[PDB]
Amino acid sequence: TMIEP
Amino acid sequence: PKKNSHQYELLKHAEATLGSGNLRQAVMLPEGEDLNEWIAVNTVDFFNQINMLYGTITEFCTEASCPVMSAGPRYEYHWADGTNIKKPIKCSAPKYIDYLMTWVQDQLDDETLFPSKIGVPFPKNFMSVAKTILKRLFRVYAHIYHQHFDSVMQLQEEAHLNTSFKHFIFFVQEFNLIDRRELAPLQELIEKL
Ligand SMILES: [Zn+2]
């Protein structure tokens, strides 16, 4: 759903 | 515009009382109001504001400018519900925002979740349903801020976006509707308000 770098 | 019911006074009540400049007090549940109904009324207005705010910069947000949903390079968003899409799908920021906005709309048009009859209680899971809606709306502010802010300021739209975001963050904070985890893309901005 929400990915970081 | 629309001319001339309890939710609708509630809405004009919420919009007008913001003019005191003190947003922390204006966002609080008025005496004796149904908490869900207060949240529902403001959630719709936030959907509408953010829908028109994004609509002003729509021409600068394109498959070419924004190949993924980004709030800065540190944060990226993939679309899932899941109902029609259960596994998060990499897509462009315009496509993703389309899916999110159509999905929010679809929940607003669902009378089980947002009853238009004034005596029908909101569902027991309403609180969870509204938290999911607002959590995703925030990511529309996040992408506009990090990417299209030059366009926001080229149009005269900076104060509009800033006042709506301040209102949004103070409301979300008052009712515990979004986790710190999710507001991290706008962290520096949220601390300054
Ligand atoms: Zn964009």
Numbering used by the authors:
A (entry chain E): 5 to 9
B (entry chain A): 15 to 18, 23 to 211
Quote the study on this structure:
MST1 T353 and T367 peptides displayed high phospho-dependent binding affinities for MOB1A, with Kds of 280 nm and 680 nm for the phosphorylated peptides, respectively, and no detectable binding for the nonphosphorylated peptides. The observed binding modes revealed by these structures are in close agreement with the binding modes reported previously for a yeast Nud1 derived phosphopeptide in complex with human MOB1A, as well as a MST2 T378 phosphopeptide in complex with human MOB1B (see ref 21, 22). As predicted by prior mutational data, the MST1 pT353 and pT367 phosphopeptides bound to the MOB1A phospho-binding pocket first identified by Rock et al., with the phosphate of the P0 threonine directly coordinated by K153, R154 and R157. The p + 1 side chains of M354 and M368 on MST1-pT353 and MST1-pT367 peptides respectively resided in an expansive hydrophobic surface composed by A89, A92, Y93, Y95, F156 and A160 side chains on MOB1A. The p + 2 side chains of I355 and V369 in MST1-pT353 and MST1-pT367 peptides respectively pointed to a distinct surface composed by M87, Y95 and the aliphatic portion of the E94 side chain on MOB1A. This considerably longer peptide sequence (31 residues versus the 15-residue peptides described here) appeared suboptimal in having disfavored basic residues at positions p + 2 and p + 3, and yet was reported to bind more tightly (120 nm) to MOB1B than did the consensus matching shorter MST1 pT353 peptide.
The core kinase cascade is modulated by adaptor proteins, SAV1 (Salvador, also known as WW45) and MOB1 (encoded by MOB1A and MOB1B in human), both of which work to promote Hippo pathway signaling. MOB1 directly binds to LATS1 and LATS2, and additionally to two related kinases, NDR1, (gene name STK38) and NDR2 (gene name STK38L) via a specialized MOB1-binding domain N-terminal to the kinase domain. Key to its function as a Hippo pathway activator is the ability of MOB1 to bind directly to MST1 and MST2 kinases. We demonstrate that autophosphorylation of MST1 and MST2 on several threonine residues provides multiple MOB1 binding sites with varying binding affinities which in turn contribute to a redundancy of MST1-MOB1 protein interactions in cells.
